[PDB]
């Protein structure tokens with residue numbers, strides 16, 4: 001068994017049953033092998049999520065060097081949008097990818113993101129803090145979105161006379177404008193802050 | 197109310213995924229049916245815990261709200277996961293209107309009041325989710341050896357593992373507040 005098959009199968013299985021439902025019983029069933037073969041090539045669930053995480057992110061990343069022109073603003077801006085699509089590409093993607101940024105498998109990506117940023121003048125400390133901020137905001141909005149959809153089912157439909165006025169004008173607004181304008185609004189905030 | 201204080205300590209004992217109304221009653225003593233009168237399901241339970249956690253110059257308003265949210269979510273296990281997406285639940289109508297009210301007072305459009313509060317909120321929440329996740333996961337993951345890291349990684353990881361989290365949080369926090377000063381000063 002090659003690592004590649006193990007992980008593509010784990011992803012198909014992630015869509016089917018979710019991060020919580022991802023057992024070694026089921027992954028083996030899918031790969032058509034006995035479980036000791038699987039424990040031969042993956043230990044704990046955490047090693048599996050780490051490899052899924054970088055595959056997920058890899059699929060959505062451009063495999064070119066940057067343009068040579070590019071500004072740090074655009075580089076952060078596409079990085080953010082690329083990450084968003086990766087997180088939205090699979091059930092529970094955000095839950096998978098949280099905390100993977102400085103695992104072994106993203107040492108390559110992180111070195112290149114740090115390099116570019118210092119390339120364009122960021123001290124090492126501002127690059128770290130810039131990437132992390134942009135990283136977690138993106139992952140956060142995707143988590144929040146998942147939740148609002150799952151939660152609206154488990155709570156009584158709300159009455160719009162019981163709201164105060166500004167809160168009504170506001171509920172309606174979020175509902176109507178959807179998910180993405182919020183995300184891009186925050187991403188533009190962080191980048192403007194960075195211009196300094 | 198003592199319903200809730202109880203629920204809070206069951207959280208720290210057993211974490212959000214072990215928190216069930218079965219286990220709450222079993223621990224309260226009462227039977228299930230006495231408890232539904234207080235709390236209908238696991239969601240409403242969470243909704244009621246969330247205000248308990250959070251209760252207990254426009255720039256400085258956003259900053260203190262932020263720091264205050266953070267302290268609340270860090271006070272209890274999976275605090276961040278309890279509170280996510282509770283901002284416009286019934287129990288928070290009062291807090292919200294207030295913040296929306298005061299923010300429009302100072303020449304924020306309501307539309308930007310909303311995207312202001314909500315950006316600061318999901319970033320603060322996310323920092324705490326992140327912190328809470330790195331703790332659990334360092335149990336499950338091999339010691340990273342620094343000679344297997346590339347150079348700029350080594351620097352960044354040394355730094356992080358020395359300066360802690362608050363700096364990272366406050367820095368991002370300032371990039372938002374700073375970017376809002378620059379959004380208000382590009383409309384009026």
Ligand SMILES: CCOc1nc(NC)nc(NC(=O)NS(=O)(=O)c2ccccc2C(=O)OC)n1
Pocket residue numbers: 097098099100101102103131132133134135136137139326330353356
């Ligand atoms: C050594 C402590 O510093 C540390 N260690 C780890 N893992 C050991 N992970 C992080 N950060 C993140 O994983 N952040 S993240 O928002 O959730 C993210 C997810 C996916 C891809 C990138 C990021 C990201 O933005 O990476 C900055 N930080």
Ligand SMILES: CCOc1nc(NC)nc(NC(=O)NS(=O)(=O)c2ccccc2C(=O)OC)n1
Pocket residue numbers: 144148170171172174175279280281282283284285313314315316317318319321
């Ligand atoms: C029109 C539905 O929109 C909607 N509805 C709900 N509940 C119905 N909650 C949200 N947002 C959040 O809960 N965001 S939050 O980051 O997790 C947060 C947590 C705790 C306290 C505040 C916030 C926050 O900053 O609220 C602005 N949004």
